[PDB]
Amino acid sequence: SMSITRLFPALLECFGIVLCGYIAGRANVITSTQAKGLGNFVSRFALPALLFKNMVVLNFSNVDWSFLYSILIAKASVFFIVCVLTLLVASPDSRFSKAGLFPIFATQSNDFALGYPIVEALYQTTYPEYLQYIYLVAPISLMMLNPIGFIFCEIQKWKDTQNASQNKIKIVGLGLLRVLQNPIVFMVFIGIAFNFILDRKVPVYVENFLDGLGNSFSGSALFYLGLTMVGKIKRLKKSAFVVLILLITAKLLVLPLLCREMVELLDKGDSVVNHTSLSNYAFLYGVFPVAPGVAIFATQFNMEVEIITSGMVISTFVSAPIMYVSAWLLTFPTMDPKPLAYAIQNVSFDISIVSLISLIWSLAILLLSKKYKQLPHMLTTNLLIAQSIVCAGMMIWNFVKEKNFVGQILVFVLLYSSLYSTYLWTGLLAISLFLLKKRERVQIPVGIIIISGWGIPALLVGVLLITGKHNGDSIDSAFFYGKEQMITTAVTLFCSILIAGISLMCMNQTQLTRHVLLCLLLIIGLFANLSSCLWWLFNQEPGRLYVELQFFCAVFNFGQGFISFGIFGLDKHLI
Amino acid sequence: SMSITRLFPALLECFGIVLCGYIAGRANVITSTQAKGLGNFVSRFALPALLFKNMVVLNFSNVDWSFLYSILIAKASVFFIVCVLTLLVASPDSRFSKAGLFPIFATQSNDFALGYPIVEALYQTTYPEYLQYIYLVAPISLMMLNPIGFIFCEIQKWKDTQNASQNKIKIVGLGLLRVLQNPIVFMVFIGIAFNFILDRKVPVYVENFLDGLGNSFSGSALFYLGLTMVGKIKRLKKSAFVVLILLITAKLLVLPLLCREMVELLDKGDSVVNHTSLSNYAFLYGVFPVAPGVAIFATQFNMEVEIITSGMVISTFVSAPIMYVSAWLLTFPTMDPKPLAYAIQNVSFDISIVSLISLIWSLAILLLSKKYKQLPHMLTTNLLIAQSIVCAGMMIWNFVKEKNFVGQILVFVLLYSSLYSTYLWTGLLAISLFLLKKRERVQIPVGIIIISGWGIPALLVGVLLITGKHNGDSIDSAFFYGKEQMITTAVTLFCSILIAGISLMCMNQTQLTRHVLLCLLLIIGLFANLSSCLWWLFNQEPGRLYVELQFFCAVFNFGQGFISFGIFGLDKHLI
Numbered sequence A, B: 001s002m003s004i005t006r007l008f009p010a011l012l013e014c015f016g017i018v019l020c021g022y023i024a025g026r027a028n029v030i031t032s033t034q035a036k037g038l039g040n041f042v043s044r045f046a047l048p049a050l051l052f053k054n055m056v057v058l059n060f061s062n063v064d065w066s067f068l069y070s071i072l073i074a075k076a077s078v079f080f081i082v083c084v085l086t087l088l089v090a091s092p093d094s095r096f097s098k099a100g101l102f103p104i105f106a107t108q109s110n111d112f113a114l115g116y117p118i119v120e121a122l123y124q125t126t127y128p129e130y131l132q133y134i135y136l137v138a139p140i141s142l143m144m145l146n147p148i149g150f151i152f153c154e155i156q157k158w159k160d161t162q163n164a165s166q167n168k169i170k171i172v173g174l175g176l177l178r179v180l181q182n183p184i185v186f187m188v189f190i191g192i193a194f195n196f197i198l199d200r201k202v203p204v205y206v207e208n209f210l211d212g213l214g215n216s217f218s219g220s221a222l223f224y225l226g227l228t229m230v231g232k233i234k235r236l237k238k239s240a241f242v243v244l245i246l247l248i249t250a251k252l253l254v255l256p257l258l259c260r261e262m263v264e265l266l267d268k269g270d271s272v273v274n275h276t277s278l279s280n281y282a283f284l285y286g287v288f289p290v291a292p293g294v295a296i297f298a299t300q301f302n303m304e305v306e307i308i309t310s311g312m313v314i315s316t317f318v319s320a321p322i323m324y325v326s327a328w329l330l331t332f333p334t335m336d337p338k339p340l341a342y343a344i345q346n347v348s349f350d351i352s353i354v355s356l357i358s359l360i361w362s363l364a365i366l367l368l369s370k371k372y373k374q375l376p377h378m379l380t381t382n383l384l385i386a387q388s389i390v391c392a393g394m395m396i397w398n399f400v401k402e403k404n405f406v407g408q409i410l411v412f413v414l415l416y417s418s419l420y421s422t423y424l425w426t427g428l429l430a431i432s433l434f435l436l437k438k439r440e441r442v443q444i445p446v447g448i449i450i451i452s453g454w455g456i457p458a459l460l461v462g463v464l465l466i467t468g469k470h471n472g473d474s475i476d477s478a479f480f481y482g483k484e485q486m487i488t489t490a491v492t493l494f495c496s497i498l499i500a501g502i503s504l505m506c507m508n509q510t511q512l513t514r515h516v517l518l519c520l521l522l523i524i525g526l527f528a529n530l531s532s533c534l535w536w537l538f539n540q541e542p543g544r545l546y547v548e549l550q551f552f553c554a555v556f557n558f559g560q561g562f563i564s565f566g567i568f569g570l571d572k573h574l575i
């Protein structure tokens, strides 16, 4: 099935080059004007030769059409609901532009650039026929859905132009002509025509010419994608943001669920293994981020560049953890016990590397800027240090099972002392934000907060250390002392959530602009972890999904540094 | 040995993409400012990743050091002769700048962009160890010769600054520091260092990241090469051009001869087949055009941009026919009788394809511009149609020998009637140029020239048709009637050369600026062809190299259209 062992390097390449593009772009080496030439080259030269070649070589006989109808119907439904509510809710002066552009935003995946390398890694040696579906699903959806949006936007231009229903032919013709002149449709039509005309075989003189342009697309397209995100997120407003929240939730969440349910509803085959693999591939297909061409369309039309560009950037970022978590969630139910144990260990190992590097970057920038010296930033720096110790502890922990038994205990104490400190530090940060905006005079005794933040977890760790019999055969940090450590974590989370929650609601009734959000996102995370803790303790021994629960704790425990890094580290601060 | 059957497709890709870069640039799609961004990506990101990966995997045990030592000594000698004469002849105010850049121009081949794809096509399945030699010879030559040139140019900056031999350390240090900070030297040193440390194996997480950036270099470097040549050739002056003539002959001609002779002198091996292949591979390596990075160095220093940019552009075009002709001449001596026959037929077939398409473009622009209507331009248009028929005739000829015998004769008459006309049209062009610049009154009776240009070859063709017995088993146009056709060609060439030659020398003693040159290059061609004709007729039956002689006629007969297209076709003319 899924060769998920070789999925992480494919996610380290796709976003490693995007990181290189970002670093190069902000380092000011290749400015925006120079970047336009690399965009024109990639978008007008590399992509048409790749599509033309692949369309020439497709063999129209082994394609399972049920998958094709399920995805096209799902995309149509997603387009329909977004357009309907956009027409129903948007303001009268600006309604047709939104109804014409939002449904394209919520349905146009980034399939070639990111989709092809990941599908190839998982599926090249297992079930070779799945790779070819990428070049079939994308063009038909583009052909059938983009012209409608351009029709609506042209209708908006006509309405603002002080007109009527006159020349109903011409709005349709301009939309069709604008769709046809894009360097994608013409070369897809030519490739399909030459597939039948030339009888499925590329001429010898032109194969290498097509391959030279075709192979240069992936790296340069990723690099220009990274270079195009520099500084585009900008400031915002309430209503905009709430729209963005819904649009990204609609795409990433509701598209894959419809795709899987329909695939499960229409395919009727006698092969259970093929049924399972096709359903999983159908789910994984929809998670792909929004295609960068939508922002190009917005720039050319000049009417929603800020919203669409912010949407594409955030959509790209949120998609990275989702593919990993979903992939390992679908491959969990049907395997052995101990290979599952290795699965949880491997996932925790992989996540700790990225969290540690992001934390190191964010902490170094915080330290160098000398901004660590004031009132609120000091507590955040303390929080990040604790998260760093948690990640380092996990890295030291994984290589330990076959080594000195004495080393087990010190690392256990270190891990849960720092994890508890991270929990309490979130509440202390919230309380300090409560105090900072109000409360004149009576400055915060920071020494007291530091003493409480470190002494309390150590005492709790020592209490857990004394009570409990060590289980030497349990290859997991969660069951060294069994029930007693696990019960303590639930109590610790509840105290932190109440302390952090009470202060935050008081602020609303009574740099801030960002700080508050880091508290808000963390509080959402702690609630999810707490429910996982509650389910296991109350329903006997081992719940219906113990592996799923443990995987959730591992993700929310070792990935917090990435969330912190995203807000704080990638900020401009003069050295 | 050399798989030359698959060398033409490799030359249709390398220069096919370069054509796309040229067309796009003049079409104004990607202007000069935008083009700088595509250079920064290729020169600083894709290229450093390609060298670093390959240097890690090299196995320093199977490398034939005799081949390695021969090229480095050969490159040094070419560098030595150019610098010595530059100091002796250059003007005193500008002498140090030229000596620091000219030897670099004549020794820095385009090995990565153009050399590697061609060597792979010929040598991937035959002798796999030849591919690895590209990555050894290129970095060492760059490291040992370029630092010397930057030393000399810096001395000129010091000299013009009114100084002395003071701070001799800093002049040496300035040259060394500038070479090291270039994104080429630093990544070669790191790759060699990590080869021994990590024991020749790339880490799994980083292999795919390097491959994504590495494979994007080949397609994008060629495309950017075409876009940088747009409009750079410029106008010129006398003393400039004569320098350019010598510099290009030094790189392309005298460098490969030294490389082959030394390889024959130092390699002492018992394998004749390996000895033959190694000697042939050494020749083809030096024919590569001047690397585009030299013009980058000229632009940064701002001192010889006009000469060096013109040199690199002209060097690329001349290299294309040279690689093709040289490759098939080394593989001619050692084969069968009848398999050689296909070689002459195949080469003539391949050259006709490129000449026919180029002629169509050049002729079409002339007709549309309505410039065909005046006195001198009219005769050139007559000349180009005649060259077109010769190329058109060869394609019908190759396919017909196994078909209707009657079709043999009509095509035979057609080919030599037009071929003879092409010879005479060259002389008529020269005489008209003689008359145009002088001779007022008494305008040219163009009707007489049109009658003379076509009626005379037809009468000569008819005489050859009657006299001679057809040889049905001779698969070649040159021996249908044996001796009588061959004798006539020599006489026809002599009359044309004398008529064209006499007028041209009269012009010197007594648009022009370009026209004259097309006559001059053609006259050089007819002399070379005539000597080939003379050798065969006077030294019995079949010379020491009959295949070589016949091959020369085929190149100069069907490739004449290519020479004409370069001057006339690639010209700006308002439609």
Ligand SMILES: CCCCCCCC/C=C/CCCCCCCC(=O)O[C@@H](COC(=O)CCCCCCCCCCCCCCC)COP(=O)([O-])OCC[N+](C)(C)C
Pocket: A011, A012, A015, A018, A019, A022, A226, A229, A230, A231, A232, A233, A234, A313, A314, A317, A318, A320, A321, A322, A324, A325, A350, A351, A354, A563, A566, A567, A570, A571, A572
């Ligand atoms: C995870 C381990 C496995 C995968 C590893 C694979 C590799 C992973 C590696 C990935 C790194 C990829 C690097 C690409 C380029 C980065 C730089 C960049 O463009 O910065 C942008 C920053 O943009 C933001 O600020 C976005 C913030 C989004 C946070 C979302 C958190 C939700 C996570 C939970 C999701 C659900 C959890 C799952 C639920 C099931 C643009 O910068 P700018 O425009 O200048 O604006 C910033 C500056 N300003 C803020 C001051 C204005």
Ligand SMILES: CCCCCCCC/C=C/CCCCCCCC(=O)O[C@@H](COC(=O)CCCCCCCCCCCCCCC)COP(=O)([O-])OCC[N+](C)(C)C
Pocket: B011, B012, B015, B018, B019, B022, B226, B229, B230, B231, B232, B233, B234, B313, B314, B317, B318, B320, B321, B322, B324, B325, B350, B351, B354, B559, B562, B563, B566, B567, B570, B571, B572
């Ligand atoms: C041959 C068949 C097999 C191989 C096939 C492989 C593929 C073959 C395909 C090749 C096509 C390659 C396309 C690259 C881009 C072309 C466009 C371009 O850059 O134009 C440049 C033009 O440059 C010149 O004008 C140079 C003229 C050189 C002529 C040399 C003739 C010698 C040939 C004999 C050699 C020895 C013979 C052999 C002896 C043994 C730049 O243009 P510009 O800067 O605007 O300047 C022009 C305008 N202006 C003039 C008005 C100012």
Ligand SMILES: CCCCCCCC/C=C\CCCCCCCC(=O)O[C@@H](COC(=O)CCCCCCCCCCCCCCC)COP(=O)([O-])OCC[N+](C)(C)C
Pocket: A012, A016, A019, A023, A026, A027, A028, A353, A354, A357, A358, A361, A572, A573, B205
């Ligand atoms: C294998 C694991 C991979 C994990 C990947 C995903 C996790 C990593 C993700 C994120 C962590 C890193 C984020 C950096 C992006 C921000 C850049 C930035 O702000 O620009 C700065 C400049 O730019 C520099 O100074 C460039 C620094 C390059 C070093 C990067 C090291 C980390 C790269 C990864 C290697 C890891 C090790 C891999 C091998 C062991 C600041 O710019 P400014 O203040 O706007 O002004 C510019 C100053 N100037 C104009 C004077 C020039």
Ligand SMILES: CCCCCCCC/C=C\CCCCCCCC(=O)O[C@@H](COC(=O)CCCCCCCCCCCCCCC)COP(=O)([O-])OCC[N+](C)(C)C
Pocket: A205, B012, B016, B023, B026, B027, B028, B353, B354, B357, B358, B361, B572, B573
């Ligand atoms: C397989 C054999 C391959 C052989 C390859 C090597 C031999 C062929 C080599 C050379 C022959 C062709 C040389 C053309 C280069 C000059 C272009 C030029 O000057 O630009 C012109 C514009 O540009 C155009 O209008 C673009 C025309 C594109 C069509 C090209 C067809 C030939 C390509 C090959 C396909 C062959 C068929 C292959 C398949 C059977 C003029 O520009 P301007 O006057 O400066 O102003 C611009 C006008 N504007 C600003 C209003 C826009």
Ligand SMILES: CC(C)CCC[C@@H](C)[C@H]1CC[C@H]2[C@@H]3CC=C4C[C@@H](O)CC[C@]4(C)[C@H]3CC[C@]12C
Pocket: A244, A245, A248, A249, A252, A253, A314, A318, A322
């Ligand atoms: C869970 C799966 C199915 C869907 C993903 C939905 C959630 C996790 C996504 C959708 C919209 C996202 C938000 C969109 C916009 C921003 C603003 C940015 O400056 C910080 C991140 C933040 C606040 C994102 C956090 C994560 C987010 C809430």
Ligand SMILES: CC(C)CCC[C@@H](C)[C@H]1CC[C@H]2[C@@H]3CC=C4C[C@@H](O)CC[C@]4(C)[C@H]3CC[C@]12C
Pocket: B244, B245, B248, B249, B252, B253, B314, B318, B322
């Ligand atoms: C014969 C092999 C080994 C070496 C190649 C040397 C000859 C063929 C080369 C070297 C220098 C070349 C010339 C250099 C510059 C120009 C100016 C350009 O506007 C037209 C072509 C023209 C006039 C070239 C014609 C071909 C040329 C004479």
Ligand SMILES: N[C@@H](Cc1c[nH]c2ccccc12)C(=O)O
Pocket: A236, A237, A238, A241, A513, A516, A517
């Ligand atoms: N414009 C702010 C909105 C915001 C930040 N923090 C908040 C807390 C509550 C409500 C809104 C916000 C943003 O996108 O970051």
Ligand SMILES: N[C@@H](Cc1c[nH]c2ccccc12)C(=O)O
Pocket: B236, B237, B238, B241, B513, B516, B517
């Ligand atoms: N500058 C001219 C020189 C030139 C053209 N034709 C000539 C004939 C003879 C002597 C010099 C020339 C050129 O490069 O094209």
Ligand SMILES: *[C@@H]1O[C@H](CO)[C@@H](O)[C@H](O)[C@H]1NC(C)=O
Pocket: A127, A269, A271, A272, A273, A274
């Ligand atoms: C999928 O195809 C068939 C069932 O349709 C069956 O051979 C098996 O389940 C799978 N085979 C391959 C080769 O994937």
Ligand SMILES: *[C@@H]1O[C@H](CO)[C@@H](O)[C@H](O)[C@H]1NC(C)=O
Pocket: B127, B269, B271, B272, B273, B274
């Ligand atoms: C070249 O290598 C040796 C001679 O050095 C001999 O086996 C033969 O000539 C060639 N072999 C191969 C494998 O190329």
Ligand SMILES: O=S(=O)(O)Oc1c[nH]c2ccccc12
Pocket: A042, A043, A047, A109, A110, A111, A112, A113, A221, A222, A224, A225, A291, A292, A293, A294
């Ligand atoms: O089908 S698309 O995903 O839109 O392909 C693309 C079109 N334009 C692009 C620019 C950067 C990366 C990918 C691009």
Ligand SMILES: O=S(=O)(O)Oc1c[nH]c2ccccc12
Pocket: B042, B043, B047, B109, B110, B111, B112, B113, B221, B222, B224, B225, B291, B292, B293, B294
């Ligand atoms: O080693 S080089 O040949 O100089 O590689 C290169 C460096 N810079 C380049 C720009 C275009 C094409 C090739 C290039």
